[PDB]
Design a protein around this ligand. Sequence first.
Ligand SMILES: Nc1ncnc2c1ncn2[C@@H]1O[C@H](COP(=O)(O)OP(=O)(O)O)[C@@H](O)[C@H]1O
Length: 429
Amino acid sequence: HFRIVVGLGKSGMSLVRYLARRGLPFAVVDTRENPPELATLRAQYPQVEVRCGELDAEFLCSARELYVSPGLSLRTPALVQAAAKGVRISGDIDLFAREAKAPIVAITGSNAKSTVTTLVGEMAVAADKRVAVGGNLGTPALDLLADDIELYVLELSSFQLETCDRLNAEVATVLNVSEHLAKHRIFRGARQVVVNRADALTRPLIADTVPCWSFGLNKPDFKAFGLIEEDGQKWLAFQFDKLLPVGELKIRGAHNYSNALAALALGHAVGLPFDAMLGALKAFSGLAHRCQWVRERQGVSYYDDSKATNVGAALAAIEGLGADIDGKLVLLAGGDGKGADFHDLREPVARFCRAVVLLGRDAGLIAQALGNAVPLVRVATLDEAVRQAAELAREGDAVLLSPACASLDMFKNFEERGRLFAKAVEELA
Ligand SMILES: Nc1ncnc2c1ncn2[C@@H]1O[C@H](COP(=O)(O)OP(=O)(O)O)[C@@H](O)[C@H]1O
């Protein structure tokens, strides 16, 4: 107990692995009497001291560092007592930041984190880098640590950044902010930043004193990635250099063009050559249920954006795909809204939608927020939502599942909702 892992779960087990494989002395504690991972720990690491129940503050103060699971309150009185006593309140990313021996690309934001992370990951692979990609919900960062790595690409949550004293990223970004200081801990020690010209809350104080690259959907200036319009066609661009027509991407929607430009900026900051980045961009087809094409039927396209589980995400996808088609959107939305203010959807819906089909627990709340902006239809099931959306759509339109809500009121998770949407779409005559 020179070091104590505080809290089991995904990251805690990666700390157990890391500390043990490095031979370091450590113990494990958890507040629950029978945490789910207790059996796995007791079986895979029988030699590790494990204490379950009310945290022994005296035991926690016998360590120099506590590695606190991200989704565990730092307000726990024993942690407060340990923190009041001088113990380092740490975590997996804090330890990773101090152990890493290669530059880190560090990505957070309210939305688009996994899209941009995986794209930078594919750029790095295409550039022949010995790259390691992880963080947040993916591969635990500590499982990536090795001397042969040339580049780390880390997606980070605010919770992981809370106990990280100085990440010292080579380049860091907050992609966007929607309902910020926790996110901005990603900039502590950052040697470069990438900012979103469309979101003022992404610009850190250090953007005045370290290299600052930007992305956005308007025409870029120096040190900026953006869109150039020429010959009626839109191009991804760096400064005055057209890179690629957006039509050669396999991902759709202006929000995904923004994600591509963010990834280009991140890869550029760490020296990835443009030919490698552009090759990966042409090959990148996006992640499952991130505005994914399902079908083209009678001139109408169908897109599964089931992972738009919050209002900021749906707004971006509505505006994004709405600006990327020949017609109007027929939007499918609703589900468990988690108390969100849906008013921000009214203007994008009025601007881009022919109609909205609403289902799920909070369809009524969404209807209240949308008012009479566009024609609304209420349905009971996803199958009926798709059938009605197809009848409402006209040639050139896109039918978009971008629900702005969690799915747990009717589905196991957003993946199941997306799959059942695609199934219904594929069963249309
Ligand atoms: N540039 C963007 N800004 C805001 N929302 C976006 C953007 N790109 C994608 N989204 C929305 O966020 C959803 C989740 O994208 P994802 O890349 O999985 O984000 P995260 O990993 O941060 O949860 C997408 O399905 C889409 O609805």
